[PDB]
Amino acid sequence: IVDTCSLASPASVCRTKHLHLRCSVDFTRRTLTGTAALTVQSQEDNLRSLVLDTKDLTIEKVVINGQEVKYALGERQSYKGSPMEISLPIALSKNQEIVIEISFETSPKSSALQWLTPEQTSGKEHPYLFSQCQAIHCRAILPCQDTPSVKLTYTAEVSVPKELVALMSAIRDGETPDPEDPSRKIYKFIQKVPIPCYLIALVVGALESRQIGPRTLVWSEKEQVEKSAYEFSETESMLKIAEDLGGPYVWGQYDLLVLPPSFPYGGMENPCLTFVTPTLLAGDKSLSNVIAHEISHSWTGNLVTNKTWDHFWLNEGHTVYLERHICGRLFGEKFRHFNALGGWGELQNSVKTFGETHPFTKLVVDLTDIDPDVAYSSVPYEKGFALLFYLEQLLGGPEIFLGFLKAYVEKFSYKSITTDDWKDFLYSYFKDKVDVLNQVDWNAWLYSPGLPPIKPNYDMTLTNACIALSQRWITAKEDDLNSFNATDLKDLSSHQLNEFLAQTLQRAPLPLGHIKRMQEVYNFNAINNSEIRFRWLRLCIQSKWEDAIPLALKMATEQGRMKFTRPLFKDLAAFDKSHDQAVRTYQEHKASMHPVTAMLVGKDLKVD
Numbered sequence: 001i002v003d004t005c006s007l008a009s010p011a012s013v014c015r016t017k018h019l020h021l022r023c024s025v026d027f028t029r030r031t032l033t034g035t036a037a038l039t040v041q042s043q044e045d046n047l048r049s050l051v052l053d054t055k056d057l058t059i060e061k062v063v064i065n066g067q068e069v070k071y072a073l074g075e076r077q078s079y080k081g082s083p084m085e086i087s088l089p090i091a092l093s094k095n096q097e098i099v100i101e102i103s104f105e106t107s108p109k110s111s112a113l114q115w116l117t118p119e120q121t122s123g124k125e126h127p128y129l130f131s132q133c134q135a136i137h138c139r140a141i142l143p144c145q146d147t148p149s150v151k152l153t154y155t156a157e158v159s160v161p162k163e164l165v166a167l168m169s170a171i172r173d174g175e176t177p178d179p180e181d182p183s184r185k186i187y188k189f190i191q192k193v194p195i196p197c198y199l200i201a202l203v204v205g206a207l208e209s210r211q212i213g214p215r216t217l218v219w220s221e222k223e224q225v226e227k228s229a230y231e232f233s234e235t236e237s238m239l240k241i242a243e244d245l246g247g248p249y250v251w252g253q254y255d256l257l258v259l260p261p262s263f264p265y266g267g268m269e270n271p272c273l274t275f276v277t278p279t280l281l282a283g284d285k286s287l288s289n290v291i292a293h294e295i296s297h298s299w300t301g302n303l304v305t306n307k308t309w310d311h312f313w314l315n316e317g318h319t320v321y322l323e324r325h326i327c328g329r330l331f332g333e334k335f336r337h338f339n340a341l342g343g344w345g346e347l348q349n350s351v352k353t354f355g356e357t358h359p360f361t362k363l364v365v366d367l368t369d370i371d372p373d374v375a376y377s378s379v380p381y382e383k384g385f386a387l388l389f390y391l392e393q394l395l396g397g398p399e400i401f402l403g404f405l406k407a408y409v410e411k412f413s414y415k416s417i418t419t420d421d422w423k424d425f426l427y428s429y430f431k432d433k434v435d436v437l438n439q440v441d442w443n444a445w446l447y448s449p450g451l452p453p454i455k456p457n458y459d460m461t462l463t464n465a466c467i468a469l470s471q472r473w474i475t476a477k478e479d480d481l482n483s484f485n486a487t488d489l490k491d492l493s494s495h496q497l498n499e500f501l502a503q504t505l506q507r508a509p510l511p512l513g514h515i516k517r518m519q520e521v522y523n524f525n526a527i528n529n530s531e532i533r534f535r536w537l538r539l540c541i542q543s544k545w546e547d548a549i550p551l552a553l554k555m556a557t558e559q560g561r562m563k564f565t566r567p568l569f570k571d572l573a574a575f576d577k578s579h580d581q582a583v584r585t586y587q588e589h590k591a592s593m594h595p596v597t598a599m600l601v602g603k604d605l606k607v608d
């Protein structure tokens, strides 16, 4: 069982039990400097060396037992970084624990971090920093066994300019002026539940909070606090349903942080402090399924964890499954099926983009020599969800399958597991239905590329109007355009508008006159909901509407969520009228983008 994304000693050799991080955030140099004190437990007799992951770190010294020890940094291995071998001064027996204190500093180019200037923030006065460690970027902040097969507690003390606030994936443990530098404050944190290191997170900036529930504050810059408090007001109700489905919430608080617009993802389930994109701020709570998803990771992902990234679908398929149950409890079972069916549509799109034989469309992936960020897609989410929804249907329905989910989280809490571990437990739980389980084509579901071998059954009540309208547009000829009118949308929710657009985008391009008519009668240009806007602008660009070029360039650059930015840049590059400007725009913005987004957009555009 091999973590092919890590160069560190594996969990079978030694295990980090605790990190004590003491660091200072230097905005003048764009570096984090400090010490990482790792409490390491040997798993072997006579252990005399170990290896940690690092990426673009400068190591000053390694101290054990109060003295400097020998270490060596190996050659860089591309996106994995450089292995750090530490020679232990005294051979360790099995189960012996020592503390290794590594003095280090990050590089400004750290792929875990984005350093924003004051002009890149809402308030325009102060800079801002945020991290994003998942999958294998923690090594670009501190030396570590950067593998989700190891779980550790942590404590931290972070020095920052005194006008700023630090927060971490941990419980706040006080603040004081920095005695070393009165222009600074030290913020302290403690995470007493063991976590994989991809869940370590840090933000520093001009942050304000507002309480929105009995265990929830929302944090943002001042300009976003009121909108965010309204947008995410369902959080407590979602936590209550999640706790009913998953068992106890063990993390103390569930806070939310609304990042600046360059955050590359919709959300990140950092324990105690979920991070979200401000593209969720639609004004009507309609994108709150992302919060339901990050809440659900407090069980599936953060308590039961994938042992290696090849098994990422265990984290995501189960979290999407729980997410859609939270949705269904709030808004009904027909809505759960609507979202499920939509997810199948997204899986169709992903499979068609990679190609039906591509290895990144397998459920269990093999990441040997693959940069995880190049493989990331909706496949583990939606092929994983589809497998669980198919099992739900085969095994007697949602109440029965929810019994398995709660038992699964209980069984594997605080552990890191593989697909075979999950499957073994599925068979144990459902021992009286083994014949039905043995009917599943496990090799195809888990290991074959392309769409799954069987499509679940979906209620189509809320989808039918979306399909009907889409088909009217696709099949319309010029003489039918006059028949469309704003009234066509009167009984469609924002969810259904989005699904109309997704169905139509699957057949794009449409004739340019059709798209012009759509704007004339439906005024989709006026919709600010990021999901609808994204799909509408893709439809416009793929249908060769030059007027949409500046709108798509603006959306691709004024926020940085990769879900939106990557396909908008790719569509702009494929449209001959926008190609040159798309490339100039990327090269203009390159240096001030998130490092991972910058990398991926470059690859997508074929621009170095």
Ligand SMILES: CN(CCCOc1ccc(Cc2ccccc2)cc1)CCC(=O)O
Binding pocket: 134, 135, 265, 266, 267, 268, 269, 293, 294, 297, 309, 310, 311, 312, 313, 316, 365, 372, 373, 375, 376, 377, 379, 380
């Ligand atoms: C922000 N976060 C994603 C960060 C990127 O994480 C990964 C995690 C795993 C991979 C490797 C992988 C990619 C595709 C299929 C299996 C495995 C690549 C990137 C998602 C948060 C969430 O799901 O709630």
Ligand SMILES: [Cl-]
Binding pocket: 054, 055, 056, 057, 076, 081, 082
């Ligand atoms: Cl490196």
Ligand SMILES: [Cl-]
Binding pocket: 511, 512, 513, 514
């Ligand atoms: Cl036309």
Ligand SMILES: [Yb+3]
Binding pocket: 061, 068
């Ligand atoms: Yb020294």
Ligand SMILES: [Yb+3]
Binding pocket: 173, 174
């Ligand atoms: Yb305390």
Ligand SMILES: [Yb+3]
Binding pocket: 159, 180
């Ligand atoms: Yb200090």
Ligand SMILES: [Yb+3]
Binding pocket: 424
């Ligand atoms: Yb077994």
Ligand SMILES: [Yb+3]
Binding pocket: 424, 427, 428
């Ligand atoms: Yb078994």
Ligand SMILES: [Yb+3]
Binding pocket: 477, 479, 480
């Ligand atoms: Yb006609």
Ligand SMILES: [Yb+3]
Binding pocket: 588
């Ligand atoms: Yb520009």
Ligand SMILES: [Zn+2]
Binding pocket: 293, 297, 315, 316, 319
């Ligand atoms: Zn997730």
